[PDB]
Design a protein around this ligand. Structure first.
Ligand code: ZN
Ligand code: ZN
Lengths: 8, 68
């Protein structure tokens, strides 16, 4: 699946 | 109004991991649906809790060595 990684 | 996502209907917060359901193509916070960011590379097909009912459970796919 497509994801959006957690950023700072 | 702004783009909103997930069961919680919130604007996009870049500090939160999100995953897209392969069936409905909507986006969910991992924390709202029980998926941890570190688990996502092992998901082959992700179905959100709603879509599980019409499309079946999500599928995991990963490599494994057993003898060592
Ligand atoms: Zn959410
Ligand atoms: Zn879905």
């Amino acid at each position: 699946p497509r994801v959006k990684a957690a950023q700072a | 109004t702004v783009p909103v996502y997930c069961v919680c209907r919130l604007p996009y917060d870049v500090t939160r991991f999100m995953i897209e359901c392969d069936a409905c193509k909507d986006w969910f916070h991992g924390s709202c649906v029980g998926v941890e960011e570190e688990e996502a590379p092992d998901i082959d097909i992700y179905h959100c809790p709603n879509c599980e009912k019409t499309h079946g459970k999500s599928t995991l796919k990963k490599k494994r060595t057993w003898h060592k």
